[PDB]
Amino acid sequence: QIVLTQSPAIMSASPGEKVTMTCSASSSVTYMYWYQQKPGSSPRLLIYDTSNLASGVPVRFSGSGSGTSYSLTISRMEAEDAATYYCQQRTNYPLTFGAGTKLELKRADAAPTVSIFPPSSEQLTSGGASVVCFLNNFYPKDINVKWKIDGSERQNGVLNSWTDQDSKDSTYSMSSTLTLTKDEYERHNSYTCEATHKTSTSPIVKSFNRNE
Amino acid sequence: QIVLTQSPAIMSASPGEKVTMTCSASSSVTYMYWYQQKPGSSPRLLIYDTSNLASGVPVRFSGSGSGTSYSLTISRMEAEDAATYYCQQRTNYPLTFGAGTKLELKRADAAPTVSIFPPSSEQLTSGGASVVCFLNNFYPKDINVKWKIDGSERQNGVLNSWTDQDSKDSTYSMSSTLTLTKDEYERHNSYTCEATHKTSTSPIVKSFNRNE
Amino acid sequence: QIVLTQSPAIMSASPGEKVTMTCSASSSVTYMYWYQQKPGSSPRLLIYDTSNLASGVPVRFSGSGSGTSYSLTISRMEAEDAATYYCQQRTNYPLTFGAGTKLELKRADAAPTVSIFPPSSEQLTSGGASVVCFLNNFYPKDINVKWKIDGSERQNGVLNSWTDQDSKDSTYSMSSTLTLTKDEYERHNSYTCEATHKTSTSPIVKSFNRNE
Amino acid sequence: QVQLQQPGAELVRPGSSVKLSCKASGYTFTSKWMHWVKQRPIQGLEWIGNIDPSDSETHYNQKFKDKATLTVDKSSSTAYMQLSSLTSEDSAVYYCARGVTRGYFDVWGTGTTVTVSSAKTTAPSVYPLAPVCGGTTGSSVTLGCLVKGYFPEPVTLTWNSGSLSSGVHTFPALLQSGLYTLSSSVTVTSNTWPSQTITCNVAHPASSTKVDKKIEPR
């Protein structure tokens, strides 16, 4: 019945430095358990009974704490450690997990690359028109999209999907797609997708015209 | 269990004349109750026990009747009286209401003003195309709309919303909107919304062309 | 509880020749029953207790068999016999039917006639765009459709409806309709519906252009 | 002689119930067994149960309990069937059937088509289909009339108020998210169109609609 809060929610650390992750319990807890989950894979046990390590766990992970405050410490951050980490408790059945500390790998500031695509003739045949705007290779994850039709902003019918952090260059990529009807698409001419990133206040602008 | 029918359903009266509203019961009833509801406000008790008036009720309202036939009479119609009036019964638990006599205010015949709007470029971006035809300031409420695409009539995808009678000029207004896809909108050129009102047999016609 | 399989599923026979239809049971059965159903009409009893004919049944139908294997034989096929025929059992409550032997009438190879239609201006007003391709008069029933937008194939949003075999010329007809939005329709120009029939390996191609 | 009359179509939302009837004449009702059969599009005939009014015997298919409750009114005259559950699975044609003892059927009823759908009754649209801009290949021109978005079935489509019927192919409707879509084609010679008037006429009894659309040349 105990509620476990893991802090912070999103971690950003560079390879080769000390990493301290913390979990906090509502009331007194006897033993703590930690779990690692890499993207697209089953979770695994790292630490059992507050401090002891599981078999197969590399010598860099450490755990400590008591009562309400507990910590998982990584002495030296490695590339294969970029994963989500979870709190785990008992002596209160349930038997609950934490929110999940997402350990993300640090990268030097990256600027997004934008490519806007007009709706295909195959879709315009069916009666639908989806304008796809690709936002590729940027750091960090947080970014804002703004669809502008003839200057006026559009909010409904927008689809936004992000990718997980890349294993090679450690950058994020997202796909922005606005869905419209054949009638709604042909009424207007200019279509713009704007990217508002932390790297620059000036929006990265890619646009096209329908009549052309 | 008694069914109460109020007659007529829609009342039309000019300010400064006698107004007689009637409610009819299925079988014998001992006492009657009446309720006033102005648009966008909670209902209130006007008459209790067939004839007695509630506190705060202006001196112009009157009630009478017996058994099956009962009446609410307004001696002199005022502007602040334009409301829906409801029947109410007991001694038969339920405890039911009438249909609702809608007292509407009378106005000298008004001709509708029509303004047709092509679908915006922002909606055409999404793939939808809605042609909006505004019908403003007309008396009375009853009116007919006819969407014509290239001459041929369209019935499916039509949305019609009316407004309540205005407090100043006492006229009605309705919004006609036909929804189409980008493919369906670009296949045809001419778009017409026709207004058939009681004031004139000749339809008020406003139209436009897509290619222009 | 016995499962009855009728073989074959689709029968093709020319008028004036012996027709043998077979039903097969899971286990031993004492008596068999057969039922005729013409398109757009209620089914009727033909054969009862394996061999005896029902009243009103023309002298050409015959039945025989035992245990697991049973047969309905038509000595001379007539035009008014083109119907679906069903197996029927008991002594095992249920009381189940067969799959249904569809007796179709034989015709000399027919080539399909194709007529492609652009979306109407009335539908393009609403925002939708349906391209209709009619495939008329062909034998046999089995045919393949292929929608090509600017060369690229489209699969989603395709509607295909077949008709029953004609009483006069004994040919099949189907209606192919692809639904698109106004945005999806105006993004592309060329629209093609291809008919792949058994009569010829070369597809019967009818197409049009949007801008024209 | 023997006639088993039953209503046309019933349209009821999921969850609620339906009471099917079968007006029987031409024979002594209380003498012969009454059976009930369910027929689906491409799944075959499925027997539900049967009642003997004599001697009250009520048999059921084990797969149909307790979706169906069979009762018989004997005055008047009919055989009743109540469907209790109602799901999208139930949407089928339900047949009345007379038989002499278990377990085969002599005469079948007209059949009632039951449609279980959460959709609401809606008016049709009707659209004119004209050939390509310019001319049609050959001597025979082809015209169409597309009816899109209507609920429920059926729709009566006639060409030229009933003056045109030869060479007309009307295609069965298909379910497309609550609303049906129907099309019809007509083949006539080039000497008749566009010299003479051709009009497709569509009427929907459930919505009281009457549309006459003229095919104008592009």
Place this chain on the structure above:
Amino acid sequence: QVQLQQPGAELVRPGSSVKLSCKASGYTFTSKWMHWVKQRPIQGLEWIGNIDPSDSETHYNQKFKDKATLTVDKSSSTAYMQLSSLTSEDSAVYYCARGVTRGYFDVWGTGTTVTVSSAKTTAPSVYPLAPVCGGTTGSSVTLGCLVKGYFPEPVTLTWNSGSLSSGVHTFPALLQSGLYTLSSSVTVTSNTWPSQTITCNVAHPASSTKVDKKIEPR
């Protein structure tokens, strides 16, 4: 004096339950009967039941059992009503009502609008409506602002941040498959547009949206 305050709107999915309340003041709560009334768009007022807190008397409409369970909290202060079933039928305005004995009502509550829908809370769109390419007939120009696809109600539409209000017709929204559609028209003279700026402003509290769209000439 006598005031019967109740919350604005409740939005709950089909199947789940709602607990309606009515904060009563201006009179001795434990003295006068508390009644509950349901009002639908075009079907009239429907009485649900009534509680006397004295003397605990709880009456119910036979058609409303056991969809409604009425209880009263007396401290604090309110009259409660739990709706158990919740279907698309239940979507209506529910009124609190005070009365002296059975069976009539003196003062009515503010009314809580209940919307039973499986739809999810969604942000609005807002589109600018400009007149025909060229000029408008007469001296008075007409402009519009179309808001399409939003859930739930309401949306506050104001012209020029509140500087324009004369000659504005705001049309009530209609339900179109889970998402509402609202339009508003404004009539002004040709000397003001496009010489001066006109902007329609839409705010949605449930999605925290603030859109200001300028009508540009075509």
Place this chain on the structure above:
Amino acid sequence: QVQLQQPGAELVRPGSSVKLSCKASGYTFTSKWMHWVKQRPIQGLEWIGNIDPSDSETHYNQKFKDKATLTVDKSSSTAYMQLSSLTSEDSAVYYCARGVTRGYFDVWGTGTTVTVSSAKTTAPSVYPLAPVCGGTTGSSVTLGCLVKGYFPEPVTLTWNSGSLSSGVHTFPALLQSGLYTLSSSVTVTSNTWPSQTITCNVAHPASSTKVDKKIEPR
């Protein structure tokens, strides 16, 4: 050594039930506790219950009764979990888990993704995405392949039958009213396109579809 194999994905309509299994090897099954965990997109891990086959001990989370019924087959070999209710809330990844006594887990199963949806299995579409009419800015050209309207997951997207993999960003699909929408981008130099052939290949196992779409210049 220790492996807990469980099936890929299960797709069942709302109302009906699912029977999940977990084939356990690498250790003595009857010795160590078997736990079950539910994981949702953005809500975290939720523990359901656990069985000891010894000594038959079956624990449950109070919030998961009686949605889950846990049983164990010991021959053969597996641990079972039946989900009874099934709602849109249930749509999640369900994990098998081994543990030595209460209450922590050593090894986790492959995980079965359960999708509770009334939607029907549908074929994909596939559309070619070409850059702007004329030329692309810089030296690196960007191409795309849009797959819209398919159910269920997954779809295998490969460029040039497997000859192109460097600089490819495949974006995860999102639910859009019963049917998924997936996109993928590829960045290559201007010397390769349109001089050499580039083709996006999509295959859907649930519909037996194989689409190869060539990106032609506009």
